[PDB]
Amino acid sequence: SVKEFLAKAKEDFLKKWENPAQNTAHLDQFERIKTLGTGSFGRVMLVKHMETGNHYAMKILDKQKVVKLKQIEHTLNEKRILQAVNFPFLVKLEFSFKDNSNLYMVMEYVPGGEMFSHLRRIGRFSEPHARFYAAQIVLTFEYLHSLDLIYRDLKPENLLIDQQGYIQVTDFGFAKRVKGRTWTLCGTPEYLAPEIILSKGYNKAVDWWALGVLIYEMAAGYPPFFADQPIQIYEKIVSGKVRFPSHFSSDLKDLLRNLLQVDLTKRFGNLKNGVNDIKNHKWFATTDWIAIYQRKVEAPFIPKFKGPGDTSNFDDYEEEEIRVSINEKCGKEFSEF
Amino acid sequence: TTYADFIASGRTGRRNAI
Ligand SMILES: O=C(CSc1n[nH]c(-c2ccncc2)n1)c1cccs1
Numbered sequence: 001s002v003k004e005f006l007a008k009a010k011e012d013f014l015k016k017w018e019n020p021a022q023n024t025a026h027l028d029q030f031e032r033i034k035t036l037g038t039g040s041f042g043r044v045m046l047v048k049h050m051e052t053g054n055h056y057a058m059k060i061l062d063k064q065k066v067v068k069l070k071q072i073e074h075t076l077n078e079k080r081i082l083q084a085v086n087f088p089f090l091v092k093l094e095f096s097f098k099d100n101s102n103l104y105m106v107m108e109y110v111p112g113g114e115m116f117s118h119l120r121r122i123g124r125f126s127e128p129h130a131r132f133y134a135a136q137i138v139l140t141f142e143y144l145h146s147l148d149l150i151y152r153d154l155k156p157e158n159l160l161i162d163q164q165g166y167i168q169v170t171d172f173g174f175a176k177r178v179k180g181r182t183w184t185l186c187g188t189p190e191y192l193a194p195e196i197i198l199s200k201g202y203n204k205a206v207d208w209w210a211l212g213v214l215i216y217e218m219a220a221g222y223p224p225f226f227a228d229q230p231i232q233i234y235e236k237i238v239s240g241k242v243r244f245p246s247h248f249s250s251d252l253k254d255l256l257r258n259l260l261q262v263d264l265t266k267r268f269g270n271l272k273n274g275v276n277d278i279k280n281h282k283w284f285a286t287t288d289w290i291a292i293y294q295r296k297v298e299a300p301f302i303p304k305f306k307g308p309g310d311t312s313n314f315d316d317y318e319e320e321e322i323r324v325s326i327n328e329k330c331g332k333e334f335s336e337f
Numbered sequence: 338t339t340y341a342d343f344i345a346s347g348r349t350g351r352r353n354a355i
Pocket residue numbers: 036037038039040041042043044057059060091107108109110111160170171173
């Protein structure tokens with residue numbers, strides 16, 4: 001029944017994947033309100049669709065900055081994957097378009113802010129609070145991996161809490177459709193799997209190690225490997241020595257010792273039972289997977305929203321006038337966008 | 338504590354991709 005759902009999901013994905021949606025809006029169809037977030041070659045702005053009065057999060061990428069950072073393929077994969085994906089725990093891409101200067105990805109506005117914001121402020125989540133989110137990530141990856149997609153950027157910053165209190169995974173810049181092994185060094189230092197650092201080839205198992213880093217962070221209030229500088233973080237990851245806070249249940253410690261597993265022949269998600277080694281684990285015993293998927297499970301925290309256009313759950317960022325050059329920039333590089 | 342070390346660290350802010 002899960003493999004039945006996933007087979008339907010695949011058919012739906014592959015059609016949108018082999019025939020991507022292009023130019024589904026124009027910049028003048030949207031009223032730019034506030035910067036919700038920031039990235040190296042763009043920003044996510046709170047936007048208002050005038051025809052509908054609907055609120056969206058529009059990701060604006062500078063084509064030249066994408067080209068400069070050799071992020072062409074990454075930007076193309078992200079739009080292609082997002083326009084083809086459909087899962088409850090993934091931000092819905094409503095529109096996508098491009099102009100002379102920028103690439104645009106109009107997404108569903110997730111008003112509750114990032115898990116990062118709430119996790120930092122609250123300190124740590126209770127094991128049931130982290131389990132609830134972990135479960136949503138578990139199914140999300142189960143979904144992405146069935147479509148042969150690697151996420152590669154899981155962290156609290158990328159997971160947005162929606163009005164119902166459910167996660168919505170954003171930032172698809174490192175998402176790649178791979179049937180086999182990949183070698184690109186990408187992701188966030190704290191979440192990198194040893195294979196990525198060791199510059200060896202890697203697969204989906206890196207998303208399971210990331211899930212491990214996320215569950216620890218959510219439960220501890222700090223990542224399992226931190227140091228003031230990235231190369232110092234990498235030394236702790238490759239070492240494969242994790243201390244667990246004294247409050248961690250034996251189940252959590254066991255789940256994490258399997259997810260944060262340097263040995264791929266032993267790493268949960270990377271074995272014969274695949275995802276079921278995670279799903280059935282003692283720490284997830286109380287989890288009803290179908291109920292999580294259907295959003296029928298009670299959220300441990302429902303965000304504060306003071307209207308459809310509210311941005312209070314998001315931090316303030318400096319704004320920059322969106323200038324659209326009179327000449328088409330990097331046109332051929334982004335022709336399929 | 339491990340928490341104090343994290344709090345005092347330079348990596349308690351929004352982390353960037355590499
Ligand atoms: O702005 C961001 C990361 S912050 C973010 N991404 N997506 C969202 C968001 C917020 C609310 N609703 C949907 C998406 N916020 C960028 C990442 C890469 C280029 S720009």
